[PDB]
Design an enzyme around this catalytic site. Structure first.
Site, short mmCIF file in Angstrom:
data_model
loop_
_atom_site.label_atom_id
_atom_site.label_comp_id
_atom_site.label_asym_id
_atom_site.label_seq_id
_atom_site.Cartn_x
_atom_site.Cartn_y
_atom_site.Cartn_z
CB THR G 1 33.98 29.14 35.82
OG1 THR G 1 34.37 29.95 36.93
CG2 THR G 1 34.01 27.68 36.28
CB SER G 2 36.48 26.14 31.62
OG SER G 2 36.37 27.29 30.81
#
Ligand SMILES: [Mg+2]
Ligand SMILES: [Mg+2]
Ligand SMILES: [Mg+2]
Ligand SMILES: [Mg+2]
Lengths: 212, 204, 125, 222, 219, 224, 196, 195, 196, 195
Positions: G1-2
């Site tokens: 995840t970013s």
């Protein structure tokens, strides 16, 4: 597994069951648990099947080399000690063996050595090895005499394996009998435990707990 | 250690033409030690038959529990419970112990009294229902039973043909399992008669 | 290691180092063995060129290999000790593994085998 | 940590007839729930009228078969092209297996052929080399599904003659090669239905005095 | 197990295989894995079966009671919530893995519900041991707003991929087509494998089995 | 015993009528870090063999050197090194398989899964797999890692059994391989868009395609 | 995840990738990680999907009930409710949440709540596995009071790099713009952001 | 193996050693002699790990018998005990140590004195008036501490030994199947056949 | 540790921080991590200090003996010797080494050898714990054929950010410039690079 | 505790239970009675974890005595055994389970039959002609399988029991210090004071 051997007036009786299991799965009901080392010497299979087969066949080779070199039958003492000294070298590596080395010579008479994978070597009159050993011992201890006939001794060995085959889940299939004399062992047949149980129940009046 | 294989034993159930059959071995043991050759694993509540394999204390407890529940059912409903209904009761009862389950392998067998339809069912220990028309197997020789049943079974067998099929399936499976055998019972169930037969087998 | 083939054949089919070893035996003090009906006697010569000898502690010519077997010899005294030691070790090894003392023939065959080995091994006489 | 062993699934079956022997095995090779191949031969002609299969961990299986085939080749070189008898092959395989007693070949080995009297022979081995002559032996994944059926149908276990009611056993009459193949095919059909690792194809090697013949049959692919 | 679902032009298409196993053994070759939640909502299940069966049954029952009280058809979001919140509360200990698809007043919706209580709202999903095989078929050929028979074939093609390539999946292919105007429950939609044929009859003759004693009780 | 550090993902392959196709992406992952973007994982040996390698990259580079040395060694005192006594795919495979099984047997494996693709002297297609355990197998389609789970199901729809191989052209086979690579890029978190593909044909020989990209990507449904 | 949230002149923009992985398998390539807890209070979610969804649903409930009684909650109030849940259940949660919102009084605000359940009010915030790779980039390139277009570019370029290096991140870059004007959703596909 | 006791009286050393051999569940033998004659006036009893005990004892026996033949002389009990200790001390840092405990009872013909040496598997040697290995001392030492005198006769030593064995038979959980008793004095080694 | 090597028009420049930690204690704040294996072949060291020092000393020996027999080794040759040691002893080593060198024929070259002992020839390379924070920055800002001054600025700015975010990095920024002109050492103190 | 045996003959049930109580190293007692009278014609022997055994037995005794007073009636052996099984089955899923195995020997005065029930700590109940717990059956069952008849007298049952105890004394490694034997018949419960 249930294996036994005992000394008596007429030599040695060896008796074994025939069952092999991998967990609860019955792999074989036709296992040969008496190893015919040579025509005069017998060994019994318990613990590791391969360990017993391999090293007692090898023992037969060593016994054959001995009598070629010394021009004389190997003693049961010497034969058993070749095997015990060999397995003792492998101690810790994970061999699994509990065997009775059985023979009848001039100098010794009928002789049984219990040999074992942690190095034990014991001379004795009665031995029982396997998961069903305690059951066999009961029948043996209460009926054993030195002055048993060959016929009665053979039956006693047969009956003792039957006792274990009935109660011990990991013993059964069939019973193999041998009679060891000074002139060599004599095979006394394969006996299906299924057929033997009912035959013995009727003729003996034993196993009243079981409906037939 | 494994609760489902301490005591040992097996159950098998089959459908035939206007009939069902359910059968079990008679062994109870403590691992290697054979303890009893009269430990029956099939019970009945009215015309619904329940076989139970596994941990023997749970077998006994569940029998007592389902006798309790089907007795109250009958008093309230004013009729005997049917196989389809009972199957759901077993499933419910097992799943209510989801995180502390009974280590058992139940098998239901029976004929619906109104439709006449033969019915058999099986469950995992927490209640998942195996609902199959041909055959249901359970116990320490379940693999062996699956093998026997898959090759011996065919549909629409008459009661006495079905007896031979299920008996041979049980016997030969039990003989390849250390922890099963020591006698065997077979129920042949028709709409208004039930035949119970004890089989002769090897006692090792 | 020193590997040199000292015991080799000559054109006439003789191994001279083995034959010259027999000449060392010829030089040694006389030894004799006679077996009766229920005994064996070993007689040995002691050369009287050596007086002022301490006969208590001087190596005796007959050596026990076990409690039931004895060995005497003619030839190099120092060489005999090596055969005697090996024979004594083998006697105890035989008792340990076979659970029976050596026969006289077995002990002989062993000693004779050690002697043979030193006639076709490198670096040894 | 590195695990040197794996499980390639597979199921094999050896049956000894009166004057013949068959060694069958499914052709599916797997790891976990994936199929590696739908046709990867597992039963091999090793020469001298001997067929062999080493079922389990396929890398150890291939290694063992390769070494045994080589052992046959060197037996010919060392002993004036003498035919390696099935009993001699069996003892030789024991030593191959027991040589790795403390780091075993993770396989269940079966060989088949004819003995020196021309009679059908099957030998069965554990991973460390204990072995026995047998009439009937299934190996691998679905062995437990196959053997009880064979006990019943080959050896007529628990079967008695109608009318006698348990007093007279059904007699042990000899089976033809056609009869044994039927039992093999139906054993694998049943195993394919009930075991996830069994399927794709069945390859049977038949051994007679005339040599080694092959038969292939499709099995269910799901 | 291979279970899958897609959203097409008029609704939802759900698909499932039929193999149920015990270890490596197949216990049932024709097990129904598509479950009723409400008349407009169905669930495909994978994961621990008892958990999936019970969790769907419980939420279906609670939705029924909800729907009796409100007097309107239940929604997929409420089925999703009820499942999700329960599964979350049990922290993954109820191993229910579901494909939830239905048609609302607000249109067709498709969810994947995981044992720990996470959900994803998607146009196409796969679950079970055969998810990758099935998903490969979707990634290859899925497009949005498919016609019904096209979507049916894609889901069927996706389940087939799982049946053949996954050892844990097998048997028949079942579909459930959901739209505003209808609900088609197709069991079985396809039979991709014939049952193996047995060459011999091994069934024993009467009297072959040895019987000790018999008892007959009428009813 | 070790653990793989820098790793390569799927290698995929299949047989078609006249030869074989093999493909693999150009990524060297360092755990979740997509560290190295220009790694060639298809290594040609002569003009008849391509060895595709997944798993540990340091071990791949070692295997690459062994194969380079193998070619040198085969040329020694060999007047037919570029003709009858050239290296065959089967020779290259058997060697690698021997090495892999030996290394696992010393408890010091080469941490890889390898597919040897090629064409033999007689025109026969060669396609066989070997891994860190020494396990080997052949199939009309072969794939390592993720590819096994996602590529094989797609490739098997083109060639489901042996009899489908003569019916499969090079265009159909390449399309399938390239399509499978797209699917892996959607779904493998340790894959890359950039890949290499190699065709070994019995008529047209070895064609080695570098710097290919996954295209025709469907994301538009994301916005909804 | 970013994930990230960035304040700018007219308010705040939230950004996120769309990749959700089970090990190396991408279980969802088109995930929506930007979730609405109130009209103009949103959050970016990282960590356990079950946990962050459960939390976000509870927060939405709390703020809905707040709104019924007391009117529109502040972004600070929203962050506090998130914090309360994350801190008090720290032992049983794996949730890294960024809370972003637009008031008219306070304008754009960003609060980051890392694993422990602490709160940190910041001009911008980055989080998720992919954030490690853009600390350098984001620190060098962030300015206060950027325009809408500049902030969209800053988030697009930042998450582009996070996606490039992090295997756990990928797919589309979603964004949500929070201003006085309203709520705007933006999406950017691989073919656009990979060539940056 | 289990119980081995030793007592040095005026003119002899008495060793008492249990007859049982148990392999886990069953008692395989009830007449086992846990002793080896090393030389005519030196006896060694032993107890410890299965196999290793007999292997060690017979190995020591062989070496002492070899020494006796080479030198035509019987080593003193002190010399034999030192040899035994060194072999055990060597063993404890080996790849696989001998897990064997011993008592050496000998009559020194030069000093005309009985001597008892206790050596454990580590090579811990002590000369004692009475000794034991394992748990045997825990039960018996309080009785020996009370009754023992250095001027005891052989018959008094056997009576004190009977009292020790009776206490063992009362308070020990294991059935060790009685003891074989052997006396070592100026005339050599003999077994008491009724005990 | 934060280390990097960057090729440019006139050759190559190596860069490194100076912090060596034992847990949270800075055991050496002025460490020299740029080490000479030959006249114009240097390396940056990360991982176990004992391992990378031992390796570097062995390599220097190998190249000294190479030089005596065969003349000046290539940078590729130097990298190969490093690789050989790192790969063959992978089980007993924790060493992440960047090898940089200047030939006249080949000009500036950079080889990175990560933990496994693989080799990767690159235009520039970054490594050490602090490198994670500058993947985004370095990828966006690196150009090929930069000037000496541009490359010094690129390394200064990059390691500045790596130091800012990584607690295991810090102190001075050391650099070594490798060109035809010779070998130049540069040092940059905190008061200079922190204000960038 | 260790050995508990049971045998049901024609007209009585005989329970034989060992006298030893061992706490690790020492045998603390050699006259312990491992039994409780539940009702005048029902006897329960027991063996298992220390403390839990007596606590369980006395708890059962108290409950059966309570029932007897409330109803002025003696519960059948079957009823008592079912009650006991339920208590053990309840126990096995508790916070801390009773680790207790029992034999219940009772004479049913209604049916005029002796009855022997074997129940392990899990609540596994079986009615048997003869039974045991732990390892006791391993040694003794082969003898009982051979000799047992349903029409045996009490004296024949005691003789077969002597043979079982002799086999146990020969092949068991533990000294269990003999057995107390009790007979349950129509006249009630009595102890055989010489065995
Ligand atoms: Mg049995
Ligand atoms: Mg059985
Ligand atoms: Mg299958
Ligand atoms: Mg990515």
């Amino acid at each position: 597994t249930t294996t036994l051997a005992f000394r008596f007036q007429g030599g040695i009786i060896v008796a074994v069951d025939s069952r092999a299991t991998a967990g609860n799965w019955v792999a074989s009901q036709t296992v040969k648990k008496v190893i015919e080392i040579n025509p005069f010497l017998l060994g019994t299979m318990a613990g590791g099947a391969a360990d017993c087969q391999f090293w007692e066949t090898w023992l037969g080779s060593q016994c054959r080399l001995h009598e070629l070199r010394e021009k004389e039958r190997i003693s049961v003492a010497a034969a058993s000690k070749i095997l015990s000294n060999l397995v003792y070298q492998y101690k810790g590596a994970g061999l699994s063996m509990g065997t009775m080395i059985c023979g009848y010579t001039r100098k010794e008479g009928p002789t049984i050595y219990y040999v074992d994978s942690d190095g034990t070597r014991l001379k004795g009159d009665i031995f029982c090895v396997g998961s069903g050993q305690t059951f066999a011992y009961g029948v043996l201890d209460s009926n054993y005499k030195w002055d048993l006939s060959v016929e009665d001794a053979l039956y006693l060995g047969k009956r003792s394996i039957l006792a274990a085959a009935h109660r011990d889940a990991y013993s059964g299939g069939s019973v193999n009998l041998y009679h060891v004399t000074e002139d060599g062992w004599i095979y006394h047949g394969n006996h299906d435990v299924g057929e033997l149980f009912w035959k013995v129940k009727e003729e003996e009046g034993s196993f009243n707990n079981v409906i037939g | 250690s494994d609760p489902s294989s301490i005591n040992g034993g097996i159950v098998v159930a089959m459908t035939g033409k206007d009939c069902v059959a359910i059968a079990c071995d008679l062994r109870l043991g403590s691992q290697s030690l054979g303890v009893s050759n009269k430990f029956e694993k099939i019970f009945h509540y009215g015309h619904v038959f329940l076989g139970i394999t596994g941990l023997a204390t749970d077998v006994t407890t569940l029998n007592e529990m389902f006798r309790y529940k089907t007795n109250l059912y009958k008093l309230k409903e004013e009729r005997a419970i049917e196989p389809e209904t009972f199957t759901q009761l077993v499933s419910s009862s097992l799943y209510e112990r989801r995180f502390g389950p009974y280590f058992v392998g139940p098998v239901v067998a029976g004929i619906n009294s109104k439709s006449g339809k033969p019915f058999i069912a099986g469950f995992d220990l927490i209640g998942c229902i195996d609902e199959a028309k041909d055959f249901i197997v359970s116990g320490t020789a379940s693999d062996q039973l699956f093998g026997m049943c898959e090759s011996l079974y065919e549909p629409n067998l008459e009661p006495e043909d079905l007896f031979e099929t299920i008996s041979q399936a049980l016997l030969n499976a039990a003989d390849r399992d250390a922890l099963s055998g020591w006698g065997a019972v077979v129920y042949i169930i028709k709409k208004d008669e039930v035949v119970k037969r004890y089989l002769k087998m090897r006692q090792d | 290691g020193y590997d040199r083939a000292l015991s080799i054949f000559s054109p006439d089919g003789h191994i001279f180092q083995v034959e010259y070893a027999l000449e060392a035996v010829k030089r040694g003090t006389c030894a004799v063995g006679v077996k009766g009906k229920n005994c064996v006697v070993l007689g040995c010569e002691r050369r009287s060129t050596l007086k002022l000898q301490d006969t208590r502690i001087t190596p005796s010519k007959v050596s026990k290999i076990d409690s039931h077997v004895v060995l005497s010899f003619s030839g190099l005294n120092a060489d005999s000790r090596i055969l005697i030691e090996k024979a004594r070790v083998e006697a105890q090894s035989h008792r340990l593994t076979l659970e029976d003392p050596v026969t006289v023939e077995y002990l002989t065959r062993y000693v004779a085998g050690v002697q043979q080995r030193y006639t076709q091994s490198g670096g040894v006489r | 940590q590195f695990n040197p062993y794996g499980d390639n699934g597979g199921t094999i079956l050896g049956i000894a007839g009166e004057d013949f022997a068959v060694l069958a095995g499914d052709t599916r090779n797997i790891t976990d729930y994936s199929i590696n191949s739908r046709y990867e031969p597992k039963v091999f002609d090793c020469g001298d009228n001997i067929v062999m299969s080493a079922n389990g961990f396929a890398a150890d299986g291939d290694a063992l078969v390769k070494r045994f085939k080589n052992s046959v080749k060197w037996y010919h070189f060392d002993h004036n092209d003498k035919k390696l008898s099935i009993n001699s092959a069996a003892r030789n395989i024991q030593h191959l297996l027991y040589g790795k007693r403390f780091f075993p070949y993770y396989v269940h080995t079966i060989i088949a052929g004819l003995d020196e009297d021309g009679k059908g022979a099957v030998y069965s081995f554990d991973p460390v080399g204990s072995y026995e002559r047998e009439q009937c032996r299934a190996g691998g994944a679905a062995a437990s599904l196959i053997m009880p059926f064979l006990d019943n149908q080959v050896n007529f276990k628990n079967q008695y003659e109608p009318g006698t009611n348990g007093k007279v056993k059904k007699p042990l009459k000899y089976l033809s090669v056609e009869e044994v193949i039927k039992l093999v095919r139906d054993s694998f059909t049943s195993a394919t239905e009930r075991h996830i690792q069994v399927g794709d194809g069945l390859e049977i090697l038949i051994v007679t005095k005339d040599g080694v013949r092959k038969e292939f049959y499709e099995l269910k692919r799901d | 197990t291979t279970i899958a679902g897609v959203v097409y032009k008029d609704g939802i298409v759900l698909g499932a295989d039929t193999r149920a196993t015990e270890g490596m053994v197949v216990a049932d070759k024709n097990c129904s894995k598509i479950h009723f939640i409400s008349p407009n909502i169905y669930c495909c299940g994978a994961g621990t079966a008892a958990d999936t069966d019970m969790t769907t049954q419980l939420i279906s029952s609670n939705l029924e009671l909800h729907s009796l009280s409100t007097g309107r058809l239940p929604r997929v979001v409420t089925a999703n919530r009820m499942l999700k919140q329960m599964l979350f509360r049990y922290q993954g200990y109820i191993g229910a893995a579901l494909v939830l698809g239905g048609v609302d007043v607000t249109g067709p919706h498709l969810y994947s519900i995981y044992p720990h209580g996470s959900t994803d709202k998607l146009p196409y999903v796969t679950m079970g041991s055969g998810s990758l095989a099935a998903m490969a078929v979707f990634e290859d050929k899925f497009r949005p707003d498919m016609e019904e028979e096209e979507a049916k074939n894609l889901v069927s093609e996706a389940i087939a991929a799982g049946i053949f390539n996954d050892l844990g999946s097998g048997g028949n292919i079942d579909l459930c087509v959901i739209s505003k105007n209808k609900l088609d429950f197709l069991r079985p939609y396809t039979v991709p494998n014939k049952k193996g044929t047995r060459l011999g009859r091994y069934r024993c003759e009467k009297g072959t089995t040895a019987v000790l004693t018999e008892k007959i009780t009428p009813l | 015993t070790q653990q793989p550090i820098v790793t390569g993902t799927s290698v995929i392959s299949m047989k078609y009528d006249n030869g074989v196709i093999i493909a693999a992406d150009n990524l060297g992952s360092y755990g979740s870090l997509l560290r190295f973007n220009g790694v060639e994982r298809l290594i040609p040996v002569g003009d008849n063999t391509v060895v595709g390698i997944s798993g540990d990259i340091s071990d791949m580079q070692h295997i690459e050197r062994l194969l380079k040395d193998l070619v040198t060694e085969n040329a020694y005192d060999n007047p037919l090194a570029d003709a009858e006594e050239a290296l065959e795919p089967s020779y290259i495979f058997e060697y690698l398989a021997t090495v892999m099984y030996q290394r696992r047997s010393k408890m010091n494996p080469l941490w890889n899964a390898i597919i040897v693709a090629g064409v033999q002297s007689n025109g026969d297609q060669f396609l066989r797999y070997v891994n860190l355990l020494g396990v080997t197998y052949s199939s009309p389609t072969l794939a390592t890692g993720f590819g096994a789970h996602m590529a094989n199901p797609l490739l098997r729809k083109v060639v489901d059994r042996e009899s489908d191989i003569p019916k499969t052209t090079v265009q159909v086979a390449e399309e399938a391989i390239v399509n499978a690579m797209r699917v892996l890029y959607y779904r493998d978190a340790r894959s890359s868009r950039n890949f290499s593909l190699a065709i070994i044909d019995k008529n047209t020989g070895l064609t080695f395609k570098k710097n290919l990209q996954v295209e025709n990507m469907k994301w538009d449904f994301a916005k909804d | 995840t970013s994930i990230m949230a960035v304040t700018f002149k007219d308010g705040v923009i939230l950004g996120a990738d769309s990749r959700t992985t089970t090990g190396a398998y991408i279980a969802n390539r088109v995930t929506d990680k930007l979730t609405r807890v109130h009209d103009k209070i949103w959050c970016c979610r990282s960590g356990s999907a079950a946990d962050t969804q459960a939390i976000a649903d509870i927060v939405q409930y709390h703020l809905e009930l707040y709104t019924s009684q007391y009117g529109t909650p502040s972004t600070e109030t929203a962050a506090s409710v998130f914090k309360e849940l994350c801190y008090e259940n720290k032992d049983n949660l794996t949730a890294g949440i960024i809370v972003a919102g637009y008031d008219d009084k306070n304008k754009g605000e960003v609060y980051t709540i890392p694993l422990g359940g602490s709160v940190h009010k910041l001009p911008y915030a980055i989080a998720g596995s992919g954030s490690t790779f853009i600390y350098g980039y984001c620190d060098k390139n962030f300015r206060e009071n950027m325009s809408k277009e500049e902030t969209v570019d800053f988030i697009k370029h930042s998450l582009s790099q996070a996606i490039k290096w992090d295997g756990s991140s990928g797919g589309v870059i979603r964004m949500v713009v929070l201003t006085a004007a309203g709520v705007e959703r933006l999406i950017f596909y691989p073919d656009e952001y990979e060539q940056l | 193996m289990d119980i081995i006791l030793g007592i040095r009286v005026q003119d002899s050393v008495i060793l008492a050693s249990s007859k049982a051999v148990t392999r886990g569940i069953s008692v395989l033998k009830d007449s086992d002699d846990k002793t080896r004659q090393l030389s005519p006036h030196t006896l060694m009893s032993f107890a410890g790990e299965a196999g290793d005990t007999v292997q060690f004892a017979e190995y020591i026996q062989a070496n002492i018998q070899l020494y006796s033949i080479r030198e035509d002389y019987e080593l003193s009990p002190q010399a034999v005990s030192s040899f035994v200790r060194q072999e055990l001390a060597k063993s404890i840092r080996s790849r696989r140590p001998y897990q064997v405990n011993v008592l050496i009872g000998g009559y020194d013909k030069k000093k005309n004195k009985p001597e008892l040496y206790q050596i454990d598997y580590l090579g811990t040697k002590v000369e004692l008036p009475y000794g034991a290995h394992g748990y045997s001392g825990f039960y018996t030492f309080s009785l020996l501490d009370h009754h023992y005198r250095p001027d005891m006769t052989t018959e008094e030593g056997l009576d004190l030994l009977k009292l020790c064995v009776q206490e063992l038979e009362k308070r020990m959980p294991m059935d060790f199947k009685g003891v074989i008793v052997k006396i070592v004095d100026k005339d050599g080694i003999r077994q008491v056949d009724d005990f």
